[PDB]
Ligand binder design. Structure first.
Ligand SMILES: Nc1ncnc2c1nc(SCc1ccccc1)n2[C@@H]1O[C@@H]2CO[P@](=O)(S)O[C@H]2[C@H]1O
Ligand SMILES: Nc1ncnc2c1nc(SCc1ccccc1)n2[C@@H]1O[C@@H]2CO[P@](=O)(S)O[C@H]2[C@H]1O
Lengths: 150, 632
């Protein structure tokens, strides 16, 4: 049993990544109201806890952080804001957990569209790092492999 | 010879007749995907039909389906009233299955295209025992060599995808006016009636409804034609009544929908006069028309909203609730007489700023609890700083609510929560999920209710952190655990979870000296409350708790919004340019869930006044700092 958490600002692609991982968009319909909606099997069982849609309720984020074991800090390369917002979430994880270090990975979603890219590639490497894309299936699974290793 | 054999009644065919037919059924395309067992049964059931003259009607639209057909020679036209020959089937093709399986009227007429056409036929009782649960073939309805409606066994065939026009057409034709099937009919129409704004807005639906209302049949004797036209008009009215009920008071926000309805009532009452019809439906239609010409907030309601300047002076603008950010800028630049390129930013008590898009609608209620709205040129963005007003109270209110009954507080909370929850219209959940700007409608009522969760949560945190006396702070934690328990008893699970989440807040869970000396009974009371929030197996703990309860209950709102979000984001609205109606049903089901929770009603003025006028700190930094100097 494993509990991974996906974090980041709205419009960053959190929900797209989560569905793309557990099941896949279009190929199957997605029902988020049944038991196995966020649980996949990879050789172990993962449950993805995503703060998508619930960004305004920061008590939801904290509950997921508390129950989490791995953390995906997703930013969008389309917007500058979204990378900055990762500073606070990085801190907030440590505060709820009460630990020195926690297994986490940085993610730079929306890497497929590069005629709108306003974020550099090495900025994330200074702060595990991947430059993923949900709608182009790039690195989607790789993200959640990292966290089980750590 | 084969003709004669295939023309004999089912129970008059010899063993050698049956044996010759079967050997020929193996060449037939339409039957290829069937088993030996099935083909042998069909051998003693398939009837040979022949018609000589083109233009001969095989069956008419609106009739009850009695047969399934396979074309051996020739071709037929699929004809629909008000559209004519919509597509044409050839030798090898089959038709008429949909009406048989769905026990529904014929959606179209089948007319012989050419002379001398040969058919194989299977009648309804024979079709149902032999073929019904073997023929899984997706029913595709075609117009202009294009899929226009797709149906599947999800037993009936349900709409999977299709054009907005054909989906409406389908849901019109299948309405049953038979009075004992009242709630069954309303339930079927409910998916479309609620979801139409996503794929077929009123600007399209209303003309399409009028066009359908006046659609006359293009075939049959005078009586046949009059009977069909009358029931068509009865079905259109039925759908209009469901459409008008769904909206209710929201119609006032749509001019096209109101113009339509006002004209439609005139059109119906005139038809009622001279045809002597619609005896029951006309008073229903009149009741709804006359009603046109905490309380729910309307999008046309007027707001006096303060929009702040960098120096913390402000303009009071007077605009509609559903006004766009662009309309807000225009109203501010009016009173400040400017053309200096204003942008609207919303800001936290924490100082966190967000630039709002020009086409964002109804932003006034999308503010955080202590959020304010600002107008400035872009070069001022980074120099903006919060107002003192935003930083919340500095002394607590324990000396007031501590004197109040835990039971009284919980009850008054749920009364207020219910008024707020009933202001939320079913469609506001739709607008919120698919995006406010696409509908240009307000979700003000939903926004204010969702805000209440954050308010209650932060109310807990505020009162604890402004309570310096450790002895009385333990009495606080005890009282909040009590209020939560009572809230959970009234089935107000929203306020319940909000208090529990307030108690688990980083600033509150820190206070070990407060938690340690809390009575052991309440320590376990809270640990049970905190295990109901367990996000395991898709919040299984909560989901089962909520399911066991009975209708009059307030759900855990953030999870409902989460469900809605992932339903939208994980499913595509359009599939091959056809409306993914499978997705529409899912969103509708989640909304009907809210309808179920409010299907039953609910069962100390100073306590009412406190609960409704909360003063909260929503600045987590400030709340941590206060907590750090209560217990370092
Ligand atoms: N069973 C049927 N259902 C619906 N429409 C039928 C129809 N049969 C016809 S053909 C008319 C005819 C001509 C000469 C002799 C006998 C019959 N039609 C005609 O085909 C037209 C196709 O376009 P519409 O504007 S729906 O009008 C239709 C009828 O006039
Ligand atoms: N747009 C449409 N509206 C209504 N009916 C349509 C229809 N299109 C069709 S045929 C589609 C087709 C399938 C295979 C090959 C070519 C065309 N049909 C066929 O005509 C029958 C009219 O009566 P039903 O029992 S509702 O079954 C219908 C279909 O088999």
């Amino acid at each position: 049993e494993y509990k991974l958490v996906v974090l980041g600002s709205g419009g960053v692609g959190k929900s797209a990544l989560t569905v793309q991982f557990v099941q896949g968009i279009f190929v199957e319909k997605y029902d988020p109201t049944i038991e196995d909606s966020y649980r996949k099997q990879v050789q172990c069982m993962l449950e993805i806890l995503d703060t998508a849609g619930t960004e305004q309720f920061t008590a939801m984020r904290d509950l997921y952080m508390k129950n989490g074991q791995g953390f995906a800090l997703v930013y969008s390369i389309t917007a500058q804001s979204t990378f900055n917002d990762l500073q606070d979430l990085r801190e907030q994880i440590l505060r709820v957990k009460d630990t020195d270090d926690v297994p986490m990975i940085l993610v730079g979603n929306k890497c497929d569209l590069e005629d709108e890219r306003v974020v550099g590639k090495e900025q994330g490497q200074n702060l595990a790092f991947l430059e993923s894309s949900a709608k182009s299936k790039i690195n989607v699974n790789e993200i959640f492999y990292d966290l089980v290793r750590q | 010879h084969m003709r004669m054999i295939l023309r004999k009644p089912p129970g008059q065919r010899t063993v050698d007749d049956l044996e010759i037919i079967y050997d020929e059924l193996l060449h037939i395309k339409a039957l290829s995907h069937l088993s030996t067992t099935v083909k042998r049964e069909l051998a003693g059931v398939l009837i040979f039909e022949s018609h000589a003259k083109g233009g001969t009607v095989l069956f008419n639209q609106g009739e009850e389906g009695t047969s399934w057909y396979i074309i051996l020679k020739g071709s037929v036209n699929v004809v629909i009233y008000g559209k004519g020959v919509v597509c044409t089937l050839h030798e090898g093709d089959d038709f008429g299955k949909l009406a048989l399986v769905n026990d529904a009227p014929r959606a179209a007429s089948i007319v012989l295209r050419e002379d001398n056409c040969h058919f194989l036929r299977v009648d309804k009782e024979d079709f149902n025992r032999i073929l019904r649960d073997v023929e899984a073939n997706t029913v595709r309805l075609k117009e202009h060599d294009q899929d226009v409606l797709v149906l599947e066994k999800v037993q009936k065939y349900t709409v999977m995808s299709g054009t907005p026009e054909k989906i409406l057409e389908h849901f019109l034709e299948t309405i049953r006016l038979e009075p004992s099937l009242n709630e069954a009919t309303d339930s079927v129409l409910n998916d479309f009636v609620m979801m139409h704004c996503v794929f077929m807005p009123n600007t399209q639906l209303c003309p399409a409804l009028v066009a359908h209302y006046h659609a006359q049949p293009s075939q049959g004797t005078e009586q046949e034609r009059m009977d069909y036209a009358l029931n068509n008009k009865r079905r259109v009215i039925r759908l209009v009544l469901q459409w008008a009920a769904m909206y209710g008071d929201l119609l006032q926000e749509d001019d096209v929908a109101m113009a339509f309805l006002e004209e439609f009532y005139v059109s119906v009452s005139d038809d009622a006069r001279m045809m002597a019809a619609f005896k029951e439906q006309l008073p229903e239609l009149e009741k709804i028309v006359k009603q046109i010409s905490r309380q729910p907030i309307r999008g046309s309601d007027e707001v006096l909203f303060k929009v702040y300047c960098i120096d913390h002076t402000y303009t009071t603008i007077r605009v509609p609730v559903a006004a766009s950010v662009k309309e807000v800028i225009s109203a501010v630049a009016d009173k400040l007489g400017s053309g200096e390129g204003l942008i609207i930013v919303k800001m936290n008590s924490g100082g966190e700023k967000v630039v709002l898009k020009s086409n964002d609608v109804s932003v006034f209620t999308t503010l955080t609890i202590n959020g304010r709205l600002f107008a400035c040129p872009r070069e001022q963005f980074d120099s903006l700083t919060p107002l003192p007003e935003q930083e919340g109270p500095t002394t607590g209110t324990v000396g007031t609510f501590e004197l109040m009954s835990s039971k009284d507080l919980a009850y008054q909370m749920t009364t207020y929560d219910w008024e707020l929850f009933n202001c939320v219209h079913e469609l506001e959940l739709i607008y919120h999920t698919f995006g406010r700007h696409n509908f240009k409608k307000t979700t003000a009522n939903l926004d204010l209710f969702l805000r209440r969760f954050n308010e209650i949560q932060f109310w807990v945190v505020t009162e604890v952190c402004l309570c310096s006396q450790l002895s009385k702070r333990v009495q606080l934690l005890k009282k909040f655990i009590k209020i939560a328990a009572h809230c959970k008893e009234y089935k107000n699970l929203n306020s319940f979870f909000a208090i529990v989440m307030g108690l688990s807040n980083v600033a509150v869970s820190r206070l070990a000296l407060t938690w340690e000396k809390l009575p052991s009974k309440f320590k376990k009371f809270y640990a049970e409350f905190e295990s109901l929030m367990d996000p395991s197996r898709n919040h299984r703990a909560y989901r089962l708790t909520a399911a066991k309860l009975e209708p009059p209950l307030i759900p855990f709102m953030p999870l409902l919004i989460k469900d809605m979000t992932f339903t939208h984001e994980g499913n595509k609205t359009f599939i091959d340019n056809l409306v993914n109606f499978e997705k529409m049903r899912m969103i509708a089901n989640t909304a009907r869930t809210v309808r179920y929770y409010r299907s039953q009603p609910f069962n100390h003025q100073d306590v009412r006044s406190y609960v409704r006028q909360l003063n909260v700190i929503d600045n987590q930094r400030t709340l941590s700092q206060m907590s750090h100097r209560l217990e370092p």
